[PDB]
């Protein structure tokens, strides 16, 4: 199905204590394949997925150089934005950046995106057409004007429509043995008495990939989305994910409830009754 390649960048200033902590990470769908950490010992772009090792020495020289260049830009922007928002040089401020591209089942370009944040709030982003910019406030505007005169959009577009995709296809090919796999969830349900007349039913979805999934409870076939507890999908740490949804039903009325599990690793959804 659809696939994407995404890079995540985080810079946090430490005025007076050290260089801003810079952390970049790369993903292909839900699999992280590379990482960099200005606090680490290698000071090189490092591998985080077996198949990335299929790359050659010039790959690591190149990605290390490019990633350091990113750190250098983020370092200047921390300063630049500080001035813009007229803030003290004492406090710690954060800059976040994300960008990447999506491809269909034929592995052809669907969409590209490049977003920038300052302290956890939109600052500026490349719109859908990949030719215009969305500025958050007055500050962003000044950057926007600067990025238009500089044709950053054109550069980002060339990368997002070409290079990004080209490489995504490439990693997809080398990672086929895994990236293109789909681990359907191993599901099960738990019935534990809660009150003297009520019972809690928890729907479990484990060991699945990608992380995308939907767990909805129904009563007599009607969605029950206002008496339930849903947990945020979470990483198992072994590549797969986990998630559970529970509802509080009158004891004796359990047979009326069913949990539906949607996951692309499944031919058709699953229905579960206690």
């Amino acid at each position: 199905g659809s696939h994407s390649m995404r890079y995540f960048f985080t810079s946090v200033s430490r005025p007076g204590r050290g260089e801003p902590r810079f952390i970049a990470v790369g993903y292909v769908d839900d699999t992280q394949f590379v990482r960099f950490d200005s606090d680490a010992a290698s000071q090189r772009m490092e591998p985080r997925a077996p198949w990335i090792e299929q790359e050659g020495p010039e790959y690591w020289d190149g990605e290390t150089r490019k990633v350091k260049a990113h750190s250098q830009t983020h370092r200047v922007d921390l300063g630049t934005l500080r001035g813009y928002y007229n803030q003290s040089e004492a406090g710690s401020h954060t800059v976040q950046r994300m960008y990447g591209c999506d491809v269909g089942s034929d592995w052809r370009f669907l969409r590209g995106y490049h977003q920038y944040a300052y302290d956890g709030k939109d600052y500026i982003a490349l719109k859908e057409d990949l030719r215009s910019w969305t500025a958050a406030d007055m500050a962003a505007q000044t950057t926007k004007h600067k990025w238009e005169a500089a044709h950053v959009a054109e550069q980002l577009r060339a990368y997002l429509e070409g290079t990004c995709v080209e490489w995504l296809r490439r990693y997809l090919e080398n990672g086929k043995e895994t990236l293109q796999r789909t681990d359907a969830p191993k599901t099960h349900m738990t019935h534990h008495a809660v009150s003297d007349h009520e019972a809690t039913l928890r729907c479990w979805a484990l060991s699945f990939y990608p992380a995308e999934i939907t767990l909805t409870w129904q009563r007599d076939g009607e969605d029950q989305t206002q008496d339930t507890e849903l947990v945020e999908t979470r990483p198992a740490g072994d590549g797969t994910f986990q998630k559970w949804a529970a509802v509080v039903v009158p004891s004796g009325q359990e047979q009326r409830y069913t949990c539906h599990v949607q996951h692309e690793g499944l031919p058709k959804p699953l229905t579960l009754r206690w």
Binding site: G26, R97, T143, W147
Partner: peptide
């Protein structure tokens, strides 16, 4: 593969 460079804001 990363962008060859990101322009300063």
């Amino acid at each position: 593969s990363l962008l060859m460079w990101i322009t300063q804001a």
